[PDB]
Design a protein around this ligand. Structure first.
Ligand SMILES: CN(Cc1ccc(C(=O)NO)cc1F)C[C@]12C[C@H]3C[C@H](C[C@H](C3)C1)C2
Ligand code: PRO
Ligand SMILES: [K+]
Ligand SMILES: [K+]
Ligand SMILES: [Zn+2]
Length: 352
């Protein structure tokens, strides 16, 4: 059984000053409609959305940050503009707080349905995204860190030691997810992301391959940064073969969370990459070999409405058990992979 959560209330979050901003309400409705058209919806068990509580938000976020975002619910437009401009790449409407609560709460219910045997795996069609959100601040279209919160929530309804792997294949680095778990060996963060020597958003050297974690988390932060090249299926397949899957298998996760942005997809106006829907199907199919198959796929970014609808639907098709479809690397991609091997071989015996 595959679970699926989609609540149309999360369409309410919008940018009232620029209706052409790519983080569109139709991101989630188009993905959902495509699941109907492909007859995938009726094959899933529908999981209800719910509001995360303020104490659940405190699993990862400060009281001050929670209160500031909560205060926007009744703000006038002039004050929503002011508040949003205080952050890196954030717009806020009165409904933004509700939608962010629903996105986190939807994934909590999905993680719970998985960890209580209700379903094997699940897909969460949620917005706004989360992986750029930090403990104390919003950033890059993200208010609360849905994937990070879900990992801590999953630990809270089972055991703190629950080994959670977060694979972040959104084309952007998940700076918030990295920082939240930077000193933690219970949550393994693996990010693949376009980097371009810091020129790609979020524009921080924190995203480079040499940032491996701190303290007891040393070795449990895996950055796979791309430079100088339009990466696609061969590069992501290779990164999975040489890095993601050997490290994950050695880590032996008990729950896989995919920060599943689809902005590395062919056609995305912000990513510039060319991962195909079949490529995303193969990455999902490989992740399902972990954690007895319990994978929760959480929508992050992705801004080509057609590309994200095809791509995420393909992932659900894989989770439903459908057969994986039929499928030289860019030179810098080998350099990137060899960089991560150099940084991480002292921590993972599977890399030698
Ligand atoms: C870098 N951009 C922001 C951005 C992009 C992607 C993601 C993501 O998908 N993370 O996972 C998060 C982000 F903060 C800026 C810009 C400036 C302008 C108006 C908007 C549309 C376009 C022209 C790019 C925002
Ligand atoms: O009142 C409402 O509708 C929203 C729901 C979350 C908090 N406020
Ligand atoms: K990423
Ligand atoms: K970590
Ligand atoms: Zn992104």
């Amino acid at each position: 059984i595959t679970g699926l959560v989609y609540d149309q209330r999360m369409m309410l979050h919008h940018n009232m000053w620029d209706s052409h901003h790519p983080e569109l309400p139709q991101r989630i409705s188009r993905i959902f409609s495509r699941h109907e058209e492909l007859r995938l919806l009726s094959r899933c068990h529908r999981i209800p959305a719910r509001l995360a509580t303020e104490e659940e938000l405190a699993l990862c976020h400060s009281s001050k940050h929670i209160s500031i975002i909560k205060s926007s619910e009744h703000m006038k437009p002039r004050d929503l503009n002011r508040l949003g401009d205080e952050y890196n790449s954030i717009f806020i409407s009165n409904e933004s707080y509700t939608c962010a609560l629903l996105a986190a709460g939807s994934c909590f219910n999905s993680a719970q349905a998985i960890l209580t045997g209700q379903v094997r795996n699940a897909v969460a069609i949620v917005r706004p995204p989360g992986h750029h959100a930090e403990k104390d601040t919003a950033c890059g279209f993200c208010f609360f860190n849905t994937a990070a919160l879900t990992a801590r929530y999953a630990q809270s309804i089972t055991r703190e030691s629950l080994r959670v792997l977060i694979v972040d294949w959104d084309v952007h680095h998940g700076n918030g997810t990295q920082h939240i778990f930077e000193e933690d060996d219970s949550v393994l963060y693996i990010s693949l992301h376009r980097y371009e020597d810091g020129a790609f958003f979020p524009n921080s050297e924190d995203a480079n391959y040499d940032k491996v974690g701190l303290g007891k988390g040393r070795g449990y932060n895996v950055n796979i940064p791309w430079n100088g090249g339009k990466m696609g299926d061969p590069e992501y397949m290779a990164a999975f073969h040489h890095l993601v899957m050997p490290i994950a298998r050695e880590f032996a996760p008990e729950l896989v969370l995919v920060s599943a942005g689809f902005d590395a997809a062919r056609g995305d106006p912000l990513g510039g990459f060319q991962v195909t829907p079949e490529g995303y199907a193969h990455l999902t199919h490989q992740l399902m070999s972990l954690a007895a198959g319990r994978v929760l796929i959480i929508l992050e970014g992705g801004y080509n409405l057609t590309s994200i609808s095809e791509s995420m639907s393909m992932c659900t098709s894989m989770l439903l058990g459908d057969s994986p479809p039929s499928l030289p690397l860019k030179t810098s991609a080998t350099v990137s992979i060899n960089n991560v091997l150099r940084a991480h071989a002292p921590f993972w015996s599977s890399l030698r």
